[PDB]
């Protein structure tokens, strides 16, 4: 049975995310003591970053940049700093080096994005207010911030090499927890269609099937139902908080009943 | 015996087989075709 319509439902959100608090900021922390910001409970549009002018590095790990405006996440972590032109490569999984091992270890199983911008016209003086840590007795763990002398000052000066100029880089870490989605992005939600094979989008759950009125007794903190084979069986309405029952579309095999061709050309179908 | 065989066949549908997830819709909605092909290939081999 082929589906006929599509159902889209989104939560109660009208706030916009404060991306400009970091992307448009004028103060950046040292590479050895990073600044971490929590963004949630807002609509996020990544097309501006996709279409941003003068962007140098824009590489998405585990997600594609163009499909990032249609997803939902539990929360997004934005982290900011300033780095040299030559040290950009170290901020990546599976990378070693002074910064990657002694300043900030990016985990191998990381999901998210990394964006780098040249900030010579804003940070260069030599701007020694930015310090990069040089010595440890062991390499840093992922997401760790540990704060000869271990710290050395940066030579961010005008006319320096582009590989030595200050670079403003932002590490966006995307998290997918069991919690209901908080950062959703812009999409239009519709009403509910019952007793039809339709396409489902109750973020972050998607699927196809038949929707009826469910009589399951969910608990107030409870969002989903599942069957014996660990298969989805019920959903909550993002806007009305109502339980919906799911039944698959019917299917089966087609067989043809025929006498010999020598006797007739008519058949029956089961 | 027949019921146990069918139950095992059904439960083998939630394994990862070294991909990032055990759902085709998820990986189709997250990744680009060039690497989605590799991970879908892994899943296909497991199911076969």
């Amino acid at each position: 049975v082929q589906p006929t319509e599509s159902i889209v439902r989104f939560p109660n959100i009208t706030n916009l995310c404060p991306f400009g608090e970091v992307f448009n900021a004028t103060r950046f922390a040292s590479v050895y003591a990073w600044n971490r910001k929590r963004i949630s409970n807002c609509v996020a549009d990544y097309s501006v970053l996709y279409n941003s002018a003068s962007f140098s590095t824009f590489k998405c790990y585990g997600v594609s940049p163009t499909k990032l405006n249609d997803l939902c996440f539990t929360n997004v972590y934005a982290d900011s700093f300033v780095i040299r032109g030559d040290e950009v490569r170290q901020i990546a999984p599976g990378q070693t080096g002074k910064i990657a091992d002694y300043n900030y270890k990016l985990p191998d199983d990381f999901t998210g994005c990394v964006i780098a911008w040249n900030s010579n016209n804003l940070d260069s003086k030599g701007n020694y207010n930015y310090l990069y840590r040089l010595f440890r007795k062991s390499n840093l763990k992922p997401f760790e911030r540990d704060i000869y002398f271990p710290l050395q000052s940066y030579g961010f000066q005008p006319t320096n090499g582009v590989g030595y100029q200050p670079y403003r880089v932002v590490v966006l870490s995307f998290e997918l927890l069991h919690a209901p989605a908080t950062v959703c992005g812009p999409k239009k939600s519709t009403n509910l269609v019952k007793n039809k094979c339709v396409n489902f989008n109750f973020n972050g759950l998607t699927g196809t099937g038949v929707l009826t009125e469910s009589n399951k007794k969910f608990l107030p903190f409870q969002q989903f139902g599942r069957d014996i084979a660990d298969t989805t069986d019920a959903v909550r309405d993002p806007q009305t908080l109502e339980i919906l029952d799911i039944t698959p579309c019917s299917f089966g095999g087609v067989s043809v009943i025929t006498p010999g061709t020598n006797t007739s050309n008519q058949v029956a179908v089961l | 015996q027949n019921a146990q065989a069918l139950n095992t066949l059904v439960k083998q549908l939630s394994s990862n087989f070294g991909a990032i997830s055990s759902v085709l819709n998820d990986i189709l909605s997250r990744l680009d075709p060039p690497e989605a092909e590799v991970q879908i290939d892994r899943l296909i081999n497991g199911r076969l």
Partner: peptide, 25 residues
């Protein structure tokens, strides 16, 4: 066979048929 029952089974067959018990998408 028991003529007084809708299912033309004997008593022993009825006893036997009550001891054996008992994903589409």
């Amino acid at each position: 066979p028991d003529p007084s029952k809708p299912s033309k089974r004997s008593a022993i067959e009825d006893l036997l048929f009550n001891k054996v018990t008992l994903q589409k998408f």
